[PDB]
Write a protein that binds this ligand. Sequence first.
Ligand SMILES: *[C@@H]1O[C@H](CO)[C@@H](O[C@@H]2O[C@H](CO)[C@@H](O[C@@H]3O[C@H](CO[C@H]4O[C@H](CO)[C@@H](O)[C@H](O[C@H]5O[C@H](CO)[C@@H](O)[C@H](O)[C@@H]5O[C@H]5O[C@H](CO)[C@@H](O)[C@H](O)[C@@H]5O)[C@@H]4O)[C@@H](O)[C@H](O[C@H]4O[C@H](CO)[C@@H](O)[C@H](O)[C@@H]4O[C@H]4O[C@H](CO)[C@@H](O)[C@H](O)[C@@H]4O)[C@@H]3O)[C@H](O)[C@H]2NC(C)=O)[C@H](O)[C@H]1NC(C)=O
Ligand code: YGE
Ligand code: CA
Ligand code: CL
Ligand code: K
Ligand code: NA
Ligand code: ZN
Length: 806
Amino acid sequence: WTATSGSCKGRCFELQEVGPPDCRCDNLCKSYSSCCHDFDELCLKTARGWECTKDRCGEVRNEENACHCSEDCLSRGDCCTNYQVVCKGESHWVDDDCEEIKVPECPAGFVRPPLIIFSVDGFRASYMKKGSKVMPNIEKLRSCGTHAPYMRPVYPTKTFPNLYTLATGLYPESHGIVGNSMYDPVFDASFHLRGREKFNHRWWGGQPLWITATKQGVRAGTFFWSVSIPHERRILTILQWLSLPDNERPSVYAFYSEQPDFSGHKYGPFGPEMTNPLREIDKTVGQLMDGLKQLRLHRCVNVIFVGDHGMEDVTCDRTEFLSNYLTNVDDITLVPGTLGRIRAKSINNSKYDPKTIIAALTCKKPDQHFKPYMKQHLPKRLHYANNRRIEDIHLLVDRRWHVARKPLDVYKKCFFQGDHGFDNKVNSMQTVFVGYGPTFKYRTKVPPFENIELYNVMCDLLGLKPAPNNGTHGSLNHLLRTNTFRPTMPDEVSRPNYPGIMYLQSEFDLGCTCDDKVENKLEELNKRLHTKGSTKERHLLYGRPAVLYRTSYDILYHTDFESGYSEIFLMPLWTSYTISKQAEVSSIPEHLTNCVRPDVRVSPGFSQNCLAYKNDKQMSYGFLFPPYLSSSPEAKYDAFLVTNMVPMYPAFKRVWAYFQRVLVKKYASERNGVNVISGPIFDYNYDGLRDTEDEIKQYVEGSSIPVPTHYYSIITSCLDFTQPADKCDGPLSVSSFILPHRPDNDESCNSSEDESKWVEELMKMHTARVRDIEHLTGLDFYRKTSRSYSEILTLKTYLHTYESEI
Ligand SMILES: *[C@@H]1O[C@H](CO)[C@@H](O[C@@H]2O[C@H](CO)[C@@H](O[C@@H]3O[C@H](CO[C@H]4O[C@H](CO)[C@@H](O)[C@H](O[C@H]5O[C@H](CO)[C@@H](O)[C@H](O)[C@@H]5O[C@H]5O[C@H](CO)[C@@H](O)[C@H](O)[C@@H]5O)[C@@H]4O)[C@@H](O)[C@H](O[C@H]4O[C@H](CO)[C@@H](O)[C@H](O)[C@@H]4O[C@H]4O[C@H](CO)[C@@H](O)[C@H](O)[C@@H]4O)[C@@H]3O)[C@H](O)[C@H]2NC(C)=O)[C@H](O)[C@H]1NC(C)=O
Ligand SMILES: CCOc1cc(C#N)ccc1COC(=O)N1C[C@@H]2CN(C(=O)c3ccc4[nH]nnc4c3)C[C@H]2C1
Ligand SMILES: [Ca+2]
Ligand SMILES: [Cl-]
Ligand SMILES: [K+]
Ligand code: NA
Ligand SMILES: [Zn+2]
């Protein structure tokens, strides 16, 4: 109930939600059924349209007009945006040559350049080129300001998750808006797009930018716009707010356009009907820029033109039905569409079994257009697991497809030709970023980046301290002229030990054997040098990783590789080695197939043992530095040390062996040498963060050898591939992965074929940023390079996506 007896007289789009119970006049009042009786009359005037015409020039002020062409309009803050063009012979902003904005040019009383966020729903990245002829304003912003070829949204590439990610710098799993539709078991509540429940504060986690601003004394315009308020009125409202007195005027603003998404759903991403929506958005941008120019603000305000996600071609006939797979189809609840989430229809159903459901959905039809996952097995790059609102069972749907429960759902819920929501690496889902203003760079292209990074930058633009978030602060400094944030490297917490030879062979009782008893200070003083670190500048190219938590670990040097060996987890945290373009691949000799050797630098009590691997029927082992890449027959013995061993399922050893025997050489060949850092990851609670020892849910049987959930590799080389990886004078190039350590290869439907037909495709799917691996290991990489730290942060957030060109 709202007593709407009050009046919006003088309160149109007021920046405070009034003391309850009261009559409301803000952008949200329609949504709450709380607007004053005269809201439409006073605050949503339309009379005479949105443009000045010559005959209106100097008119006598008629308050009924939507906007004014009277002489006092600049003072009242309410001219139509084209007033000075039509009445004062000024030019439209788009027609002006662009001129570098070296410093903010603001009216007196402006304490900081304002920030205007102009967000566009479904604005696919390729619209910037493909629609450029019909978007002159947007094209000027783009070419004159700072732009990226595209911006990566978060998964799921839906609207609320991405807009709220833009505002918070958080992964959906952390901010809590994990889809357009949600169930929260704790609250026992549901979130729907249509309705009232979506406004309830409990859904919205983290700290959105408007709150960050407010708490730090920076006033914000309201981010939400009611759907029925036309764009022209949205623009005039922002412009009016920008004419408020100094003590009342917000410094940050948001605009939101439902287009081009709205038409994109109906007509597809490139339907001929899409041209007009693009024209219209551009016209709106033009109205903003003309309006700013009238206020002498067009060289003061920073404007961000940003999309939430792209749009893909999707039609009704391209729908997979769960009823073609499950016989028990009515015992489940499915959240459907461009992603799938499955839970039990009833929690009193004790005959509900996620494992048979997953199995019934696994590789069942030859061209199957979705893949089932337990959420913790989703590629780590999606960061889509750590929230009670995300169902244990998940379907990754192929681009261009939908999943639904039964055919009746699709015809008694074609209507639509476009949709989005797919994997955030998908080209069609990529969206846009342009920054224009005094604080952004001039005519500058920057590499693609993730939308999670923007919150930090928006905080920088406003002089705000960002709340804790998933951005890497400083990774986008290259977008900015000034206001850069100068981060320092985190301090190493644990310093390594440097163990020498301290144990005799016979002190070890590991059930390991090796055929290594085969026998001159020429090559005897030389092997001492290699164990002291004589080749370490070759295999450790960017300094050792810093360990950012309290632990006990040893640096171990070898001819071919260096490792940081954890006495706590009984294996390396990291193993670093360089493979030149010229390196030769050899096999593991017949006599050395089962060879595991005690490491006389490391105590029996801090070593693994072969017995545990013999007794454990499920678990085998692999090596971090690959024996296949040993530099000499003698060096090869080093690769068999018990301190280079890690636990591996036979099914996963298929993946790992192929990567080590075939792919590393191939990368070294294509990239002119590679440096590789591999290691284990433990994330049993799937929070994206390094497990502590007491979080490990699985051990090699009858041992304290913990089982990794994943294995990572970071593969670095020279950006200029004419220089070898170990002699690179400039910027680096990286690709990384976090492979799930699974006892089966069910995820790969082709896995019974030769590794050459499925292993690399698996690896590509599990591509990762170095930053993802940092979170997962508590390690800090690239501590010693010749590169600026901000450039290193950018490199660390890079993701190799394996899509073709946009
Ligand atoms: C991406 O960036 C984000 C942001 O930086 C990272 O997330 C942070 O990670 C921290 C480490 O996991 C986490 O810190 C914990 O906070 C607990 C209390 O936190 C509350 O207050 C904060 C601050 O305002 C608030 O942000 C939190 O909001 C969460 O919860 C509400 C309600 O559900 C949501 O509205 C909101 O969306 C958010 O949910 C998300 O996070 C929670 C985890 O907090 C998830 O469960 C959800 O799924 C969702 O993702 C909270 O309201 C605090 O209790 C923790 O402290 C425990 O552990 C420490 C060890 O240091 C110990 O000292 C304490 O005693 C305590 O242990 C006790 O609790 C244990 C569990 O109950 C119990 O087992 C013990 O026996 C003890 O009793 C902890 O410090 C921080 O909350 C989040 N922040 C956010 C916004 O998510 C994220 O990690 C980054 N991701 C990556 C991949 O890098
Ligand atoms: C929530 C955070 O809101 C921001 C953060 C920033 C930032 N940074 C900037 C602007 C904003 C402002 O958003 C708004 O005014 N809103 C009002 C719109 C209603 N809504 C939908 O119903 C909807 C639902 C499903 C869809 N599928 N496809 N299209 C869809 C559209 C999307 C909402 C965006
Ligand atoms: Ca963890
Ligand atoms: Cl959803
Ligand atoms: K075994
Ligand atoms: Na398989
Ligand atoms: Zn949409």
